[PDB]
């Protein structure tokens, strides 16, 4: 029965881990239950990019991002996050939120804006806190994502 504070802290730690996996895999990272969740998240995110490459691969081009400035990335992330959930919350939609955040973060890092990753993580953290946290607690928390596969 996690608290809202813990759920948000885990949301940001899961974001950092997912992003770190993607940066390392993209080749631009030149620097228990939780690990289970991270592996599921990466798996479901990858499946999303596999099935819908035109939407989740090349996030920056999809959103028409030219400058990787802090206001552009933050407004791009928030505007997509708002549209993702307008019709309800599901685990698949949460996965899509992380996939958008990581696609943006990879593009920032490739364009000499690695400082932006901290901002993306904070934006996802605050969006979860204000939009999703009560739904997560009804599911039993992040561990419920293990029910998204077998």
Swiss-Prot record:
Q: Which GO terms describe its cellular component?
A: mitochondrial outer membrane
Span of the annotated motif BH4: 12-24
Q: Enumerate the GO terms in the molecular function aspect.
A: channel activity
Task: Tell me the compartments it is located in.
Answer: Membrane
For the motif BH2, give the residue ranges.
135-149
Keywords (alphabetical) are: Apoptosis, Membrane, Transmembrane, Transmembrane helix
Topology in the lipid bilayer is annotated as: Single-pass membrane protein
- Chain location of the short sequence motif BH3 per the record: 37-53
Q: Indicate which residues form the motif BH1.
A: 83-102
Q: GO:BP terms for this protein? A: extrinsic apoptotic signaling pathway in absence of ligand; intrinsic apoptotic signaling pathway in response to DNA damage; positive regulation of apoptotic process; release of cytochrome c from mitochondria
Q: Which family does it belong to?
A: Belongs to the Bcl-2 family.
* UniProt function note: May play a role in apoptosis.
Q: What is this protein called?
A: Bcl-2-related ovarian killer protein
Species source reads: Gallus gallus
Its ancestry begins with: Eukaryota, Metazoa, Chordata, Craniata, Vertebrata
């Amino acid at each position: 029965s996690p608290t809202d504070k813990e759920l948000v802290s885990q949301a940001k730690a899961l974001c950092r881990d997912y992003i770190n996996s993607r940066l390392i895999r993209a080749g631009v990272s030149w620097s228990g239950k939780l690990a289970e969740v991270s592996a599921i998240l990466l798996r479901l995110g990858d499946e999303l990019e596999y099935i819908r490459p035109n939407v989740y691969r090349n996030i920056a081009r999809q959103l028409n991002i030219s400058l990787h400035s802090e206001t552009v990335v933050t407004d791009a992330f928030l505007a997509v996050a708002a549209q993702i959930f307008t019709a309800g919350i599901t685990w698949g939609k949460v996965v899509s939120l992380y996939a958008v955040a990581a696609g943006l973060a990879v593009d920032c890092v490739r364009h000499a804006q690695p400082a932006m990753v901290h901002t993306i993580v904070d934006c996802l953290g605050e969006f979860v806190r204000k939009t999703l946290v009560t739904w997560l607690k009804r599911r039993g928390g992040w561990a419920d994502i293990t029910k998204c596969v077998v």
